[PDB]
Structures are given as C-alpha cells and as structure tokens.
Amino acid sequence: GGGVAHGPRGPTSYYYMLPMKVRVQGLKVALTVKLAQDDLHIVDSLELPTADPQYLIELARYRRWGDSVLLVDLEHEDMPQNVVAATSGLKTFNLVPAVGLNVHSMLKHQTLVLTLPTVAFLEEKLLWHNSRYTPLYPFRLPYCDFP
C-alpha cells in the first residue's frame, strides 16, 4: 500500500514562449502552403443567399472544396446573419474572426477561405514585423507611429 517512488508531481505547467518573429513567420508559412497547394480561396462579400446549411454543403461540393472548411471574417460584430446561422449549424464547416487565425486550425481544415478585407488586414499586420525595431517596453504603450 506504499507511496509511489517518483510518479507525477503536483499540478504541472508546460509553458514556453516562442520568440515573436518565429510565431509570425510560422503564420506566413501556413498561409503560403495553403496558397501553393491550391487549397486557399479568397472570397469577397460573404453575404449568403439564404440561411440553409444545405446551401453551404452543396456550395462545397460544386466547387470541389474538399472535406472540411474554415472561414475567416474581419470582425466578430460585423458578421452577416445568414452566414452566422448557417455555419453555426455545422461541424465540418467552421467560422472564425480574423483575430483568431492560427496555425493549428489552418492545418486542421483542408480548405481555408478568407474575406477580402481580411487579406488587407493580415497582409498588413504580418508584413509589419520585417521592418520593426526590437520592442522597448510592451507595445500596448504609446509609440510614435504604432498605436
């Protein structure tokens, strides 16, 4: 009935912070891969003709979009109604604001779909890191050009 000699000890946290530019270039590479394998599709508008999920599935089939799909919109408040409903009714399809793009999810869905203002967004944010200085204090604080 004795004690365990070594065994798992206490609540353990695995926490390590990758340097920023590595995370950024990771994001870039994921986008690049998506594009060069033909599995990226840029969309504009995103207004749906109707809220019926069958429309979205058939729209996947007729365009041969592959099995699972992720959709990325610029903002969370600015999402159109029909889309929110129709997508919130499905597992294989998925809907996310642009703030929440990430590598793991990009690899989890066979097909990525971006709104146009979303490309205008990402391209800007990510491109900004080649030309930046090393941070002085946390970037949330006031800088000359950067908000």
Partner RNA sequence: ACCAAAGCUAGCUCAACAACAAAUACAAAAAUACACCAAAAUAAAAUAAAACAUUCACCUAACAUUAAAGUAUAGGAGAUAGAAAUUUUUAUCCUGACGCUAUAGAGAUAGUACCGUAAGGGAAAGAUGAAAGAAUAAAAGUAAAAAAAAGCAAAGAUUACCCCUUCUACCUUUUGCAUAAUGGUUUAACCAGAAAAAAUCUAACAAAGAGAACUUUAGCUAGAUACCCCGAAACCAGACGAGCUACCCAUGAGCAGUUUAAAAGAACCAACUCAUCUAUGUGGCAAAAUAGUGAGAAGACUUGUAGGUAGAGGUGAAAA
Partner RNA sequence: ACAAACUCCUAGCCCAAUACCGGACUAAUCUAUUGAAACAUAGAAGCAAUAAUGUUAAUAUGAGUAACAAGAAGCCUUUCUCCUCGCACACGCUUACAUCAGUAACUAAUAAUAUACUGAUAAUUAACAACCAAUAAACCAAAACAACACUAAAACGUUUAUUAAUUACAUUGUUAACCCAACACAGGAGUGCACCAAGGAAAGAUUAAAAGAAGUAAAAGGAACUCGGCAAACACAAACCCCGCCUGUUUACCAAAAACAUCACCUCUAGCAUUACUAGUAUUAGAGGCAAUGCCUGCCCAGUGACAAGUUUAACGGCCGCGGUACUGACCGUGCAAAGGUAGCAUAAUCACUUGUUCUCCAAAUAAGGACUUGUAUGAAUGGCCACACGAGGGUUUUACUGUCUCUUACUUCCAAUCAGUGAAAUUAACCUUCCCGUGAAGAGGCGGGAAUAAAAAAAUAAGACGAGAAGACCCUAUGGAGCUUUAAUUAACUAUUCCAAAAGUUCUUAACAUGGACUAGCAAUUUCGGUUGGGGUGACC
Residue number with CB closer to RNA (111 or 115): 111
Shortest distance, CB of residue 27 to RNA, whole angstroms? Answer: 11
Shortest distance, CB of residue 118 to RNA, whole angstroms? Answer: 19
Instruction: Say how far residue 102 (Cα) sits from the centre of its chain.
Output: 4
Question: Can you tell me the distance from the alpha carbon of 28 to that of 34, in angstroms, rounded to the nearest whole number?
Answer: 10
Question: Can you tell me the distance from the alpha carbon of 52 to that of 83, in angstroms, rounded to the nearest whole number?
Answer: 9
* Residue 8 touching RNA (CB under 7 A): yes
Structure-token pair, residue 127: 């491109």
CB within 8 A of 122, min separation 6: which ones? 31, 98, 101, 114
CB within 8 A of 139, min separation 6: which ones? 146
Taking CB under 7 A as the rule, which mask of x and - marks residues 47-86 in contact with RNA?
---------------------x------------------
- Which residues, listed in sequence order, are joined to residue 41 by a DSSP beta bridge? 113
Shortest distance, CB of residue 64 to RNA, whole angstroms? Answer: 18
Residues 96-125 contacting RNA, CB under 7 A: 104, 107-108
Residues 20-39 contacting RNA, CB under 7 A: 20-23, 25
Interface residues toward RNA, by CB under 7 A: 1-2, 4-8, 10-11, 14, 16-23, 25, 68, 104, 107-108, 133-141
